[PDB]
């Protein structure tokens, strides 16, 4: 039912400096933390109302990881332009997404740690959280460096520990918004479904299937039967 | 809560 996710970007500049590091944290589509490297004194910023109750030590533990990452990701980009024979004169990007999924029960369903270079898949942690998945001969270079540094074991201990403890804690503090399900307001072609939460909805074959778009009130919209979590019974629509 | 990167964790 619930999940946590961190999204990183490490984008190259045209000279010897200075790459930009953005980090963003989510609890099922709801942005809660944001760090941007560009600023005189970059700090991790709250984005959701429920994260504001956290202490100074929490805001500094995050800032230190993200500021170290602003450095650790510069060396990684250089290593990468090195395996791929790229000049300093281009803009190159490393994208990463990691996190945990849990069931209604309260146990970790599966852990994630995925990376991409220049927009496409580069290295990923497997279901057993004990082995890696490489894309090209340059990814097998990263993998060997990771098997040696016991990288998977650290990610597994985090995903099974810290990540589960903090998600359950975030879900508890923000239960009024996170643990609640808003049902879609429907109208009829056109098969509309407005103001629902979460995004996962089924509107029902070769039909006009538009992507799930955000409203700006943390609610969702989309455009036959409307199946959603917030409904105790799947809606039957036809008009006139 | 994010995960820290230990030493030698680079790409």
């Amino acid at each position: 039912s619930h999940s946590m996710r961190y999204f990183y970007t490490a984008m190259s500049r045209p000279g010897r400096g200075e790459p930009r590091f953005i980090a963003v944290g989510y609890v099922d589509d709801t942005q809660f933390v944001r760090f941007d490297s560009d600023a005189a004194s970059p700090r991790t910023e709250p984005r959701a109302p429920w994260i504001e109750q956290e202490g100074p030590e929490y805001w500094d533990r995050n800032t230190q990881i993200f500021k170290t990452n602003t450095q650790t990701y510069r060396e990684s980009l250089r290593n990468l332009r090195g395996y791929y024979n790229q000049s300093e004169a281009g803009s190159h990007i490393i994208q990463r997404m990691y996190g945990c999924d849990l069931g209604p029960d309260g146990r970790l369903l599966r852990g994630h740690d995925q990376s991409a270079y220049d927009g496409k898949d580069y290295i990923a942690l497997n279901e057993d959280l004990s082995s890696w998945t490489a894309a090209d001969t340059a990814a097998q270079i990263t993998q060997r460096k990771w098997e040696a540094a016991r990288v998977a074991e650290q990610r597994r201990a985090y995903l099974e520990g810290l990540c589960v403890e903090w998600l359950r804690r975030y879900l508890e503090n923000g239960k009024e918004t996170l643990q609640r399900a808003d049902p879609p307001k429907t109208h009829v072609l056109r098969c509309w479904a407005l103001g629902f939460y979460p995004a996962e909805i089924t509107l029902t074959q070769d039909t006009e299937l538009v992507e799930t778009r955000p409203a700006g009130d943390r609610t969702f919209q989309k455009w036959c039967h409307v199946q959603h979590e917030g409904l105790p019974k799947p809606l039957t629509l036809r008009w006139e | 809560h994010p995960v820290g990167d230990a030493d030698y964790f680079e790409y």
Partner: T-cell receptor, first 111, second 112 residues
Framework: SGVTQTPKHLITATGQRVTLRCSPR?????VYWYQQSLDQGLQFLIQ???????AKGNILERFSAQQFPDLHSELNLSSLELGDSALYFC??????????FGEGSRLTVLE | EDQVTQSPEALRLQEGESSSLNCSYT??????LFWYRQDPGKGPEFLFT???AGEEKEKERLKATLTKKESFLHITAPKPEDSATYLC?????????????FGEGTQLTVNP
């Protein structure tokens, strides 16, 4: 272990400056500084990785360090006070996670 | 947040008399738990690393266990040569790097 610290012993007066030197274990890229005072535990000062500052502990403004491109580290302690008398250890980290300690620098500060 | 507590501070044993050294810790998350042996005025020497709970490492007369809250160093039939101060250190995966937070040590003396 393979970590080499120098000088093993230093005797100085109060107000003086000293430089401690450290060579990390062959192949290691990181340098960690700890202070072990008498009848006290190992306290973390600062970390350097590949010539660059990383985690910084309880290091004093009176104190500064650096890691050179050759990978060696220098820890500078200035305006020395009696309380600065300690065993200063340097350690280098291995890929698997463990830190390998040097044999330490025993500083004695006298009036 | 990061703290290690070893107990007892000093341990006094007779030769061949087994004992346990305790090390309680708190972390945001555990990367690993380290056991070191330090001889008076010398650099701490690495014994073993326990990565997860249930894990066990044994080197001669030393056996190290791990739980979510504590680690034990079991010393079977000690000898005077085993006398040293035993250190425990913890690594946090809720922070950057490989830094260790040390306990204050358990000073062991084995009366021959």
């Amino acid at each position: 272990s393979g970590v080499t610290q120098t000088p093993k012993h230093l005797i100085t007066a109060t107000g003086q400056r000293v430089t401690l030197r450290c060579s990390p274990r062959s192949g290691d890229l990181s340098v960690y500084w700890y202070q072990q005072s008498l009848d006290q535990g190992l306290q973390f000062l600062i970390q350097y990785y590949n010539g660059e500052e990383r985690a910084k502990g309880n290091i004093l403004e009176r104190f500064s360090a650096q890691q050179f491109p050759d990978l060696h580290s220098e820890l500078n302690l200035s305006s020395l006070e009696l309380g600065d008398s300690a065993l200063y250890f340097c350690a280098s980290s291995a890929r698997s996670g463990e830190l390998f300690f040097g044999e330490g620098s025993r500083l004695t500060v006298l009036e | 947040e990061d703290q290690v507590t070893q107990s007892p501070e000093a341990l006094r044993l007779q030769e061949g008399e087994s004992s346990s050294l305790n090390c309680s810790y708190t972390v945001s998350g555990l990367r690993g738990l380290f056991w070191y042996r330090q001889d008076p005025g010398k650099g701490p020497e690495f014994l073993f690393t326990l990565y997860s709970a249930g894990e066990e490492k044994e080197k001669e007369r030393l056996k190290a266990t791990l739980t979510k809250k504590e680690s034990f160093l079991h010393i079977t039939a000690p000898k005077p040569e085993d006398s040293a101060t035993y250190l425990c250190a913890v690594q946090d995966l809720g922070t950057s790097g490989s830094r260790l937070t040390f306990g204050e040590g358990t000073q062991l003396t084995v009366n021959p």
